[PDB]
Every structure is written in C-alpha cells, then in structure tokens.
Amino acid sequence: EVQLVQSGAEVKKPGESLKISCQGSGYSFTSYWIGWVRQMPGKGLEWMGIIYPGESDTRYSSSFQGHVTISADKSISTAYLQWSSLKASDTAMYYCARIRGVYSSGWIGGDYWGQGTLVTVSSASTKGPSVFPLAPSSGTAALGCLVKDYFPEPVTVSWNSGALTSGVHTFPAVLQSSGLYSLSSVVTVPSSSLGTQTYICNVNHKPSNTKVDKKVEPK
Amino acid sequence: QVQLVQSGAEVKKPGASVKVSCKASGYTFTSYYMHWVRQAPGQGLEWMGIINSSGGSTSYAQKFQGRVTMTRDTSTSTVYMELSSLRSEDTAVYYCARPPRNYYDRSGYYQRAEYFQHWGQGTLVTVSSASTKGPSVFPLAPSGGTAALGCLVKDYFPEPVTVSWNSGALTSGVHTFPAVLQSSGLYSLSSVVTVPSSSLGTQTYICNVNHKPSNTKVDKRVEPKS
Amino acid sequence: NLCPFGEVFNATRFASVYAWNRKRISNCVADYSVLYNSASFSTFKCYGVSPTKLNDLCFTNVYADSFVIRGDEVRQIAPGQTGKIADYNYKLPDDFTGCVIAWNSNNLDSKVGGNYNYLYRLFRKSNLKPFERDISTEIYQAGSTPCNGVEGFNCYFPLQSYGFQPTNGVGYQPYRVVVLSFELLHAPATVCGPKK
Amino acid sequence: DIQMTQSPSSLSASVGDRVTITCRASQSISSYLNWYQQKPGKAPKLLIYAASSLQSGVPSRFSGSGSGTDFTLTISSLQPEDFATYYCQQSYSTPRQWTFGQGTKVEIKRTVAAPSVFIFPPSDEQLKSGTASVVCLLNNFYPREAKVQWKVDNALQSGNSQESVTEQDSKDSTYSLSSTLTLSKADYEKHKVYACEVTHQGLSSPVTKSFNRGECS
Amino acid sequence: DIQLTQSPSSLSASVGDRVTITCQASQDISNYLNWYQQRPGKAPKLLIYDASNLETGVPSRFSGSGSGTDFTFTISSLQPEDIATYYCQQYDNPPLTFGGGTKLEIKRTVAAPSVFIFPPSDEQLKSGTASVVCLLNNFYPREAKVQWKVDNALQSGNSQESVTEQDSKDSTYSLSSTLTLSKADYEKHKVYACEVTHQGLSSPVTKSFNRGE
Ligand SMILES: *[C@@H]1O[C@H](CO[C@@H]2O[C@@H](C)[C@@H](O)[C@@H](O)[C@@H]2O)[C@@H](O[C@@H]2O[C@H](CO)[C@@H](O[C@@H]3O[C@H](CO)[C@@H](O)[C@H](O)[C@@H]3O)[C@H](O)[C@H]2NC(C)=O)[C@H](O)[C@H]1NC(C)=O
C-alpha cells in the first residue's frame, strides 16, 4: 500500500528556521513527483511546489518560489519543506502528496496524501494542558474529560487507550480570550455500566511533551 | 553522403534522341522517387516528370508526353531520362533531383512531400548539327606582390569544359570565365588564378581541363616564361 | 490483452534523445485507434503503412522509441533527413515502416528559469547508423591534439542541454516524440490489430 | 493565472439523493481536471482525475464529466459518510500555476433529532486552581441550530461561555455541542443553582439540566 | 497548370539589408510552396519548404511566409554569399511548376580592377593564330571598358570579352578580353597594349608588352 507519513506538529517563534518531512513507502520513491500543499486555518488548498526525487528537478508554485525550499533524500524515501525565516503568516497545515503522473500534455493530481503537519508560528509560550474529569451524574449516561489551557494545537484524546471509540465525541478546540486553547472529550455509555466499567481518557500534547491519563469515576 | 552523379554532356542533332543517367549512392535507392528538371541556358527551371525507383512507374508533364521516357536500374542504383525528337528548345542542363519520402497522415490520407533536397550536378545536352571538337590548352604565363596566371582553353564544341587547378587543391583566387562563342562557331574560355608572386619559384601550378564530349583530359603546367 | 501503449505515450519521464528509450511490444493485441483518433498530436506521419489500416494488420514485433527534442527538430525524425538529431542522436532507416508521432509538451517539460535535464549529442566522429544509440561521454577530439580525457580548445564535452523555458518560441519548446516501428520478419506474427 | 471557481458554495442533501457540483476554469484546461474530497480534520483524497477517470478504490457512485472550461462532479446515491468539502483542481498548466477551486461543502440532510442534554459541575481538582468550568453537553441532534442558555441562581449569563460543535456524524448524520461556562472560583462559590437550558427544533419545550453546588449531582 | 509569378526580376541591395522576394500562385496552393537558391553554375539548393520551414543547416536569416496564393521569402540581413537566383516551386498539384526566378545582386563600394596582360604562348604560335589576353580582376561596379592597341593603333572587331558573376566572398566582378590575330599579323607588330577605364580609376590604366622581349 502506498503511504506518506509526515513529521509531527511544530511550534516556532517568528524568524526561526524550520524543516518538516514526509516519508513515502510502498512504491518506487524515485518514480513519482511528490510535493507540498498549504491549507491555512479555515481556508482552501494551495500547491507550493513539487520535486522529482533523484532527478535534479524542483518546481515551485509562483507565490512560493523564493520563500521555501523543497528537497528530497531518495535513499530514505523522504521529501522536505524548509523555511529559513518563519513569519506568523506561515501558520498552517502542510500536506505532502504524491503526484500520480502525467498523460498526453498535462498532469494528474495527487493520488496519495500524508496526514498533514500543523505548523504554528507564534511568540507565545508552549503550555501543556490540565485535564479534569467530567463525572457522570447520579438509560444512558455521559462522562468525559476537560482538557484546559494549552498552546499550541494540537492535543489528541483517546479513551481506554483506543479500546473505547463508540459514543466518543472529542470537540474541536476553542481559543480562549486567554490565548490558550481548551477542548472537551465526552462519551455516552449505559448507566448500568458506571459501577463496573473503567473509563480513562488519555491526553497527549506533544508540543509540550505532556501525557496525562485521567480516570473518570461517578462523582 | 547522398550523392547523385550524372553522365557527361552530349551534343545531338535535331530529331535525334539523348539518354542521360543519374547514379545514386549513399542511401537505399529503391526507397525514394526520382524527378527530372531541366533548365535552358539563362532560363528558369522546368519539371519533366517523376519515376518510382522501386517499381519503375512514371508520370510525365503533358508537354513531354510521347517524347520522354524515364527508367531505372536497381542493381546499379541508376535512373535514366531519354528524350527523343530533339529540337533546339531542348538544349538545356538536365538535373535529377530527389525529394524525401511521402507518408500517410493520421486520417489515412496520402501526403506528397515534393521538395528537392538532393540534386545531381546537371548534364548539358546541346541540340546542334555541328561536330564535337576538343579544345587546345595554352598557358597564360605569369610575368612580395600578386601574380596572375591561367590557361586559355580554345576552340571546342559543345560546352562545357571544366577547369580545376592543382587537382582541386587550389581554389582561392580562381576565376574561370564564361565561355565565349567565336565567329568560327567554336567556344573558348580562360581560367585564371592570382597567387603570391613569391610562390612562383616554388609552387607548381597546373590547370586540369576536361571536355567530356571529346574525351579530352589535359593537365597543363603553367610556368613563368624563360 | 492490449499492447501497453499508455506506458510509452503517458510515461512521466521521457528519455533524452541521445539516450532514447526503446520499448519492445510483443504478443498482444494493438488497438491503434487510441492514437489515430486522438487530436492531441502535432505531428503524425506514417511511412509504408496507413494508420487507419493498422487495426487490420499483423506484425512480428512493434518497437516504441521515445524521447524529447525541440519542436524545430521533429522534422529530422523522418527517413533521409540530416541535422544534429538525425546524424548524432536518432536515425531512421530509408526503408522505415512505421509512424512518427509528436506533441508539444511545454507544460510538462519546461519551467521558468529553465529545465536543463534533456540533453542531445552535439559532436560525433561519424553519423549514427539507423536505430543506433550512443550514450558515451568521451571528450570529442575536434582537432589534431589528443584530449586525454580533459576538456579545452578543440576538446569538447559532446552532450549539450536544451534549455526549455515556457516562454520559448514553439520551435524551441519541448516535444515528446514516439516512433513506432512495425517489424515484418519471416517469423510468426505476435502483434495484431483487433480486426485480425 | 487560470482561475478555478466552483458552484454551489454549500448544499444539503438526503441519503440516496444525487449531488451535482460544478467547476469552471477561466480558460480551457482540456481534460486535466481533478476532484478531491476533504473530510473534517483529514487530508484531501483524490476522487477523479482526467475529468472523468475514477481513482482506484473510490466508490463507483462518484463520477465526473466535462471538458474545456466546465466540469461536473456527480455523487449518485449519497451516503452518510459523504459529507465533506469537495475541491476541483486544474492540472493543465505547469506546476508553477496549478490552481484549486474554493470548495463546495456537502452536508447530509436527515430527520430532526432532539439533543440529549447533560450538565457537568466543575471538578474539585479544578477548584483548587482558582477557576470553575461548568460544561453543558447536547448530544446527537439535528439540525445544527441550537440555543443554549446558562442560568446561575436563575440569572441569565452573558459573555462568559464558549461553544464547540462536532462535525456531522459519519453514520447517523447528527451533531453534538458543548457549551462551557467559565467562572472565577469566588463567583462559583457565591451561587447555588447552575442550569443550562436548551431549545431545539426537536423539543416541544426547552430542556433544562441543573445541579446545586455542594450536593450529589 | 498552376502559374507562379515571382517578383522582382532582379534587385540590388547592400550587405546587411533586408531582402524581400514574392511569389503569387494563380490558384490556392495551401502551403505547398518551396524556395531554392541557385548559385552560378550550380544546381538549385533547397532553403525553405512548405512555405515557412527551413531546411537543415540553412542560416536563420532566411525565412518564408504565406499561405494560399501570396508567398514571401526574406533575407533579414543580406550576406555576400547570398548572391544567387532564387526560385519558388509549388507541389499542390502536378505538373510541379517553378516561378521565373529572382536574381539577387550586391551593391558594395567601388573597387578598381587589377590589370594583367598575357602574350600568346609559343605553343599556340605554331598554329598560325595568336591570342592576347587582358585580365581585369576583382572590380566593382560591373561596367568597364577595354581598348586594345597594336603599335598604338586602336583595334576593333577582333576581340571578345567575358565577365564573371559576382564573387561570393567580395562581391566583385572579373573580366577577360581576348584579342585574336593571325600569327602573321602578330609577328608584324611590336607593342601590344590593353587600356582599361573604370570608375575606380582616375586615369586609364594601360598594360603592355613588346613581342619577343
Ligand atoms: C494516455 O492517457 C489518456 C488518459 O487516460 C486516463 O489516464 C491514464 C493515465 C490512465 O489511467 C487511463 O486508464 C485513463 O483513462 C488516455 O486517453 C483516453 O483515451 C481513450 C481511448 O482513446 C479515450 O476514450 C475514447 O473516448 C471517445 C469519445 O468519448 C470514444 O469515442 C472512444 O470509444 C473512447 O472511449 C478517452 O476519452 C481518453 N481520455 C482523455 C482524458 O483524453 C490515452 O488513451 C492514453 N494513451 C495511450 C496511448 O494509451
């Protein structure tokens, strides 16, 4: 199976440099163009450029030429996107994508995509979240975890280390007037289960290397 | 490396016939058509016809129909043009000429590509009642500057003669003049060359005259008179 | 099972003409209508055969040669032609039976600032024979002094880059070229049209 | 330099409906037109290339057509998991000039479903910190529009809560919503009754969930 | 048949000038129109085919255009080696036909002739005829006058002249004049002279010899 795997979310101060990466597997890395797409928060998609690994050929989209460097290392099947001096304007999700190829006199779009790399450019300090229980009350019961006061995005939440997925709603994060993010993750479960079943929310905030488990018990 | 080499000039009487050859080399003979084009002295070009070098089929311009035949010999890579019932208007240089191959386009229509990329050197055919006569070749002798010397090629018929110097090694400064027709009805021309006067006591100068109609080949040494 | 013409005509990467690619096409049914019904081509010339009769014909093998050259050189990919391409890079025989197919590839093969990855051979001691390929990179001795593997006066690297930029005039824009050779030997046919 | 524009901007359609979306190029792009699907929080996925060829593994209910300047994506028999934003992208030009349309949002229409409502007190652990967050959850409702009001000792709150809404569910096409009321610990300890009141098309009258600070809730 | 009317019949231009020649077909011939260059005493050479395509090796100063009935052939910057007669030729329909030709000549600066005179050879005298040759080498413009004198008497009716075509490197002409006398008359006189007048000479140039000296 073709797979593209990108490096993890990054937070950088303005003016710093940054290099993110994307590793292709399951195909001949030197046989396909691969490149980078920017998606700014709440916006659409923009090509930044593409590279043909091992053939000395990088092509930049017109608004990105001169502002980023795209490169590749075929021996580790990895493509790169690099800024010498970041601006807060570079805060975005970045995707790598394999270009399927060409036909006749034009191109095909991207047939396989990486999972995306969130890049946050900010002067604010990184801060790990606090995790608080949303305890079930007293048919159906609801419980959860409040993940409060972190920066930057993202955090991820699982329940019971991935075993509990049905009924789970992890809400999009909200930016508080503080400048810090918060989110909640909730799950609905049968009321009869509350005595016996274990519910642990697992919170990971990689930018701060924070891992928190919270056991959520009837109040 | 495509070469088309034609036979030598000939004189023929009014009412007679002439046959000119064009020997092809340096390519696959049967892959290409051959055409013939003629040119009367001082006039323009006139297309005569086309022959398929592989199967021999022909098409002639209407004005030559019944007088011209074109043929080909594949084992000798040679094309021939015979013209019969000759008249004065047939005095001309006859050229063979080779276009590239025709082809079919994407819709299946046959497309002709009739632009002549290779030409023979031409064959002058003179239609005349007069006899063939070979030339005599006389020296025009030179007498740190520049010297002129040459050869006078006198009293021949028909045209042409060719003149080279030192078997083609000397070409710079050579002027071979157009022949003049004398009162006798015979042609004459001169070829001259200018050389450094300092070479006259060291370099040999030889004019090579050929008049193929009379099978005359002459190499004349041209020296300062002593 | 259909002959894989798409692998040739729609390849992501085309060869430099001095290192022209050949794909042998054998033991398959060739539907040439995907070619001759296409409006995508700028040159489509067949020698010794009409392309609209191909779907009813059988050949021993088919060869598909491909490469990029500039538009004003496509004329050299024909029997009997001369020039740097015909003489030193890719030579068709006089008795060629096949089709020469080309199309402008400016939006694939040129870029602002120049794409220099496509090369052609500029010097050779003798002309190529038909379907000969020369990928050597020996220094070309253009004079009397031996080069001894070092470049200099009268001692040239023999390959040159095209510089394809999209604002080039069309004569200097890149063209992808496919030459189909239809081989007929005293041997069983292995490539037939659908009607045969 | 080739502008790509899409229509409509968003649409809502029921399971089994046919969805039709169009894309226009400012000059001919021949057939070099791609359609992508982007689901919330996921990478774009290629559906169609060469205007009408289906990418491997993509269900046959997706099809594309058109040429030149005008193109259509059709989703037959729309499925709940098809909610997404769909993008066209021309790949006729050099990569330097490749451009995307701005996207068409496709939402799934379904029958009205009233929310289930839950209220959560601040935890003792958070109270140690000086802040109290009170959370109200509305679960699995349709349509998206909902009114949540916080009352503290029966006084309506304003300006001290924030909401988050999930994206449409992949199987049953419902939404969930959280509203979080933020109070100082001092203000939280000053009052007794905490209530969130929910009004929604699926409810005959508003639903209120409440607790009393300091009591089993 | 298709008639091709080529214009002008001849023209004279300076090195570096733009040269324009035209060919009109009597019917629509699409773009099936070729242009040839014929240098003096050579076969025609193909330069342009199918109205606008350059043949291999042809310098980029040459071009052609047109489609239907009106065709143009251009030299953007005339060079000395371009002296020739040019012909158009159609192959839309047989018989293939050619235009009447356009002779292209170069205007350059005045150059006076270098003059040489040659006595009859001893080998020819054996024959009873004596040819005396006067050479005017590398001059411009083409107009020149040669006058033969024998013992200072002006000759007429016993001479012929020949002039080369314009030289492909320096655009000059050369001329030979041959005086023909019986051996008896040649031996009866002493001083043989050819007197040359030309635009590059302020005075006539005379070259002479004395028989047998
Ligand atoms: C090169 O590739 C093009 C594009 O085809 C698509 O992309 C490829 C990379 C592959 O993934 C293909 O599977 C995919 O289709 C091929 O072009 C297509 O050619 C076919 C066959 O000629 C065209 O179909 C025809 O359409 C007409 C009009 O509707 C019908 O009358 C015919 O009966 C036939 O169905 C098709 O329209 C065309 N597609 C495009 C977008 O141009 C191309 O054939 C291929 N080259 C070769 C040599 O195989």
Residue numbers in the entry:
A (entry chain M), B (entry chain H): 1 to 52, 52A, 53 to 82, 82A, 82B, 82C, 83 to 100, 100A, ...
C (entry chain A): 334 to 529
D (entry chain N): 1 to 95, 95A, 95B, 96 to 215
E (entry chain L): 1 to 213
What does the literature reporting this entry say, word for word?
Here, we report on crystal structures of a cross-neutralizing antibody, CV38-142, in complex with the receptor-binding domains from SARS-CoV-2 and SARS-CoV.
We then determined the crystal structure of SARS-CoV-2 RBD in complex with CV38-142 and COVA1-16 Fabs at 1.94 Å resolution. COVA1-16 binds to a highly conserved epitope on RBD in the same approach angle (Liu et al., 2020). However, CV38-142 binds to a less conserved surface with no overlap with the COVA1-16 epitope (Liu et al., 2020) and involves the N-glycosylation site at N343 on the RBD that is distal to the RBM. The crystal structure showed well-resolved density for four of the sugar moieties attached to N343. The VH S100 amide hydrogen bonds to the post-translationally modified N343, and VH R96, VL Y49, and VL S53 hydrogens bond to the core fucose moiety of the glycan as well as water molecules that mediate interactions between CV38-142 and glycan. Overall, CV38-142 interacts with RBD mainly through its heavy chain, which contributes 79% of the buried surface area (BSA) on the RBD (629 Å2 out of 792 Å2 total BSA as calculated by the PISA program). The crystal structure of the antibody cocktail in complex with SARS-CoV-2 revealed how two different cross-neutralizing antibodies can interact with the RBD without inhibiting each other.
